[PDB]
Amino acid sequence: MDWVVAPISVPENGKGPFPQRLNQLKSNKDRDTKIFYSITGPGADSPPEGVFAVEKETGWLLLNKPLDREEIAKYELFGHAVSENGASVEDPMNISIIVTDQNDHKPKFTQDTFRGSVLEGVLPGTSVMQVTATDEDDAIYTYNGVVAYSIHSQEPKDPHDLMFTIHRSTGTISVISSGLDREKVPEYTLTIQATDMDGDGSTTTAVAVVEILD
Amino acid sequence: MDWVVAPISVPENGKGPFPQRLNQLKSIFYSITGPGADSPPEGVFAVEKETGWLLLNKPLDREEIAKYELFGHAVEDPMNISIIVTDQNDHKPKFTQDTFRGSVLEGVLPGTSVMQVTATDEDDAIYTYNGVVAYSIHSQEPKDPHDLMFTIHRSTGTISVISSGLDREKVPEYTLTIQATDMDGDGSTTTAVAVVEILD
Ligand SMILES: [Ca+2]
Ligand SMILES: [Ca+2]
Ligand SMILES: [Ca+2]
Ligand SMILES: [Ca+2]
Ligand SMILES: [Ca+2]
Ligand SMILES: [Ca+2]
Ligand SMILES: [Ca+2]
Ligand SMILES: [Ca+2]
C-alpha cells in the first residue's frame, strides 16, 4: 500500500539545521543493481538553484536553506533514478513541495485615520463606513493572514458610550444607537484595532472619525 | 520510483474547511486504526472507504498532540501512516517574573554577569523560531554616569555590565525595562523590569 501522491509540506523559516532531510526516494529496481538519484527543476538545477538537493546513493531529498512562502509558495521538482550504466527503468517522479505559512507579517491598516459620515436619524444597524487592514500572510489555509477587527474605545461618550460596533471580519463600522445629534456631538473618534491569526496574533491600531450629518 | 516512507506534515489550527483531505491511500475497501482514529482521541482522522482518501476531521493543536501514528488497511499488510503536526505561533512570550534582581560590587570589570532573566514561550523552539525568545533592553534609568551601561545576551538573557563607572554613593541602583520577543526577535514582545543593585 502506498500514497497516490505525497506532496511534502514544509513550513517556511525552519530552524533546520541545514541541510535538512525531507523524505527518501526509492527506485523500483531495488535489489538488482546500484542506483544513483538526482533531482531537477526550479529549486534544484534551475533558478533558484541548490535550494534542494538529493543524496546520490541514499537518496534522501534534502533542503539546503530555510524557505520563504511569500517568495515561492510551491516547488515542483523531478526525481531521477539511473543505474551505474546510465540506464533508467522508470519515469521521473513528480516531487511537490508545499511551503506552509508562518505568521511572519504583521497586520497593517491601509490608513492611520479612516473617515466616515452618517445621518443623525438613521436606523440602528446602519453601516457608517468600512476600515481595512492587510496582512501578507496566507489567509486561505491558515489564519495568519486573517484579521479580526475591534474597537478599543470611543470619544466623546455622548449621549453615551458604546454607540458604534465593528464587524469582526469585514471591518464595517455600524451605529447601534438612536440619539445622534450634531448640535450636542458633531463628531466621534474611535480607536480601532486589527489582530491577525483571527484575533490571537499581533495587533495594530488606527483611528476612525465619524462625522454626524444634517 | 516512490517514497520509502512519506509522513504528512499538517500545520496546527488549519482553516480547512473540515473534513479536509490529506493524501490518498492506494492498494476493495479502506479503513484506519490507531490513536486518532479508533482509539483515543477517537474520530480525529478518518478515511473514505472507497476512494482511500485520508481525512482530517478537525483542526489540530500541536501543543496537545504533536504527532500521530496510524495504520491504514485494505480488504497486503497494514501501512504505517505518520502525521506530524507542525507549529504555528499561537503563544506569546512571557517573563517568569515581573521583576528580576541581581547585584554587583562597584569594582567589577566590564563584561561582569549581573543576572540571568528568562521568558517562556509554549511554542516549538526545535523546528521553528516560534518558541525562540530574543532578549533586549528597552531602556535604563538613571543614565548616570551614562546610558547603555548594560547589555543582555540575545538568547541566554544574561545581563552584563559594560560600563567602568559604577559608584554606589552616586547611583545605588539601576532599573532596566527589558524585552523578550518570540520568532527570535521578529514576533511579539513582552516586557519586565530588572533592578541592578550596586553592592555596599
Ligand atoms: Ca516569509
Ligand atoms: Ca500575519
Ligand atoms: Ca508568512
Ligand atoms: Ca496550539
Ligand atoms: Ca501538552
Ligand atoms: Ca511564540
Ligand atoms: Ca504553537
Ligand atoms: Ca562600599
Contact B74, A1 (CB under 8 A): yes
Q: Which chain A residues touch B8 with a CB distance below 8 Å? A: 6, 9
User: Which among B88, B118, B146 is the end of a domain?
Assistant: B88
Contact B102, B196 (CB under 8 A): yes
Q: CA dist B67 to A55, A75, A114, B36, Å?
A: 27, 25, 45, 10
> In the PDB record, what is the listed experimental method?
X-ray
Longest dimension (CA), chain B: 87
Q: Ligand 2: distance of its center to the CA of B175 in Å?
A: 34
Q: Are residues B53 and B94 in the same domain?
A: no
**In Å, how far is B144's CA from the nearest CA of chain A?**
35
Contact B125, B131 (CB under 8 A): yes
User: Which among A58, A83, A102 is the end of a domain?
Assistant: A102
In sequence order, the 6+-apart residues with CB closer than 8 A to the CB of B39 are B33
Backbone φ/ψ region at A125: left (φ over 0), alpha (ψ -120 to 50), beta: left
**In Å, how far is B178's CA from the nearest CA of chain A?**
19
Q: Tally the C-alpha atoms within 13 A of residue A174's C-alpha that lie toward its C-beta.
A: 14
This structure's resolution (Å) is 2.2
Provide the β-strand partners of residue B68: B83
Q: B131 exposed, middle or buried (CB, 10 Å; 0-12, 13-18, 19+)?
A: buried
Distance of CA A186 to the CA centre of its chain: 40
Q: Are residues A98 and A108 in the same domain?
A: no
What is d(CA B137, CA B157) in angstroms, rounded to the nearest whole number? 10
Rounded to 10 degrees, the C-alpha dihedral B116/B121/B125/B128 comes to -130
Q: Are residues A92 and A128 in the same domain?
A: no
Number of H helices, E strands in chain B: 0, 17
Q: Are residues A73 and A146 in the same domain?
A: no
Q: Are residues B161 and B188 in the same domain?
A: yes
Q: Are residues B33 and B94 in the same domain?
A: no
What is d(CA B100, CA B118) in angstroms, rounded to the nearest whole number? 9
Which domain does A167 fall in, by range? 103-214
Q: Are residues B99 and B177 in the same domain?
A: yes
Cβ of residue A140 closer than 8 Å to a chain B Cβ: yes
Cell numbers linked to B11: 500545520
The per-residue DSSP string of A33-53 comes to S-EEEEEESBTTTBSSTTSEE
Q: Are residues A111 and A199 in the same domain?
A: yes
Q: Are residues A90 and A110 in the same domain?
A: no
User: Which candidate, B183, B154, B108, B175, places its Cα nearest to that of A11?
Assistant: B183
Q: B200 exposed, middle or buried (CB, 10 Å; 0-12, 13-18, 19+)?
A: exposed
User: Which among B54, B73, B88 is the end of a domain?
Assistant: B88
Cβ of residue B188 closer than 8 Å to a chain A Cβ: yes
Q: Ligand 4: distance of its center to the CA of B66 in Å?
A: 10
In sequence order, the 6+-apart residues with CB closer than 8 A to the CB of B134 are B154, B155, B180, B181, B182, B184, B185
Of B3, B11, B129, the CB nearest to A23: B3
Q: Are residues B75 and B110 in the same domain?
A: no
Cell numbers linked to A124: 440602528
For residue B126, what is the DSSP state?
S
Q: Are residues A48 and A153 in the same domain?
A: no
What is d(CA A200, CA B188) in angstroms, rounded to the nearest whole number? 11
Residues with CB under 5 A from ligand 1 (ion): A 12, 68, 70, 104
What is the chain B residue with the closest CA to A199? B90
End-to-end CA distance of chain B: 74
Q: Are residues A63 and A12 in the same domain?
A: yes
CATH number at residue A53: 2.60.40.60
Q: Which chain A residues touch B89 with a CB distance below 8 Å? A: 102-103, 197, 201
Provide the β-strand partners of residue B115: B159
Q: How many domains does chain B have?
A: 2
